[PDB]
From a paper:
Odorant-binding proteins (OBPs; aka PBPs, pheromone-binding proteins when they are involved in the detection of pheromones) are the first relay in semiochemical reception in insects as they are the liaison between the air medium that broadcasts chemical signals and odorant receptors, which are located in olfactory structures (mainly the antennae and maxillary palps) of the insect's peripheral sensory system. We studied the structure of the major, female-enriched odorant binding protein (AaegOBP1) from Aedes aegypti, the primary vector for the viruses that cause yellow fever, mostly in tropical regions of Africa and in parts of South America, and human dengue, which infects 100 million people yearly in the tropics and subtropics. Mature AaegOBP1 is a protein with 125 amino acid residues, which shares 82% amino acid identity (91% similarity) with AgamOBP1. The overall structure of AaegOBP1 comprises of six helices (α1 to α6) connected by loops between helices and knitted together by three disulfide bridges between α1 and α3 (C26–C57), helix α3 and the top of helix α6 (C53–C104), and helix α6 and the top of helix α5 (C113–C95).
Residue numbers in the entry:
A (entry chain A): 2 to 125
B (entry chain B): 10 to 125
Write the structure that this text describes.
Amino acid sequence: VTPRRDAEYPPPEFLEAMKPLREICIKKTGVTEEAIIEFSDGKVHEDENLKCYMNCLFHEAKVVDDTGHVHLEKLHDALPDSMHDIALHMGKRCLYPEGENLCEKAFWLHKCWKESDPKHYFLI
Amino acid sequence: YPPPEFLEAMKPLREICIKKTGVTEEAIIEFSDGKVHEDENLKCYMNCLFHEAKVVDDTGHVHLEKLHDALPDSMHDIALHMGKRCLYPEGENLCEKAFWLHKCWKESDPKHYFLI
Ligand SMILES: [Cl-]
Ligand SMILES: [Mg+2]
Ligand SMILES: [Mg+2]
Ligand SMILES: [Mg+2]
């Protein structure tokens, strides 16, 4: 299925709310705009800087536990109300990330989400 | 509700686990439909069902995706909302963590929570 992109979805308030965090995280990780857009709207691809950008966003958004790992309940609680059920179905077979570091774990989650629901998956 | 197919599938696991853990039938019904309570054998009964249902990982902790997949499809959505704030169990052993999950589910949706 093809990615949903319109005035209503992804939720504009969420996209604007993540702007400053994206700016922080692009500066820290050196990910290209092209890697982000391609991962969001195109085919899954694996780029090292993108993985740490993904991790960076979790950290800046304060959706991590006290060891720096993604806390999926905090993440759900943080998401827009309009995404409540979308996020639940997108995340339900992505509960236990695997990876040698937090960048790899963050990428595991995004890849799993994208695989699960390519229509509603997007990357800030 | 509960879905008939689940009641049927659970029966052989209940038999094994009541025998193994010594939990009382009354303890099960009390937890299922009444107030949350702690009974030691109940907690290990709960663990035993997860083990016998083969929904645990290599160290015996519940694999919540396996659990979800093992539930009747009619309970998919109910399970999802029960589970959404019950992801990271706490406890000193598998019985305490198994209880933690059941308590968390029961606290989240008492109307649809049951224990067989
Ligand atoms: Cl919710
Ligand atoms: Mg919310
Ligand atoms: Mg199911
Ligand atoms: Mg709750």
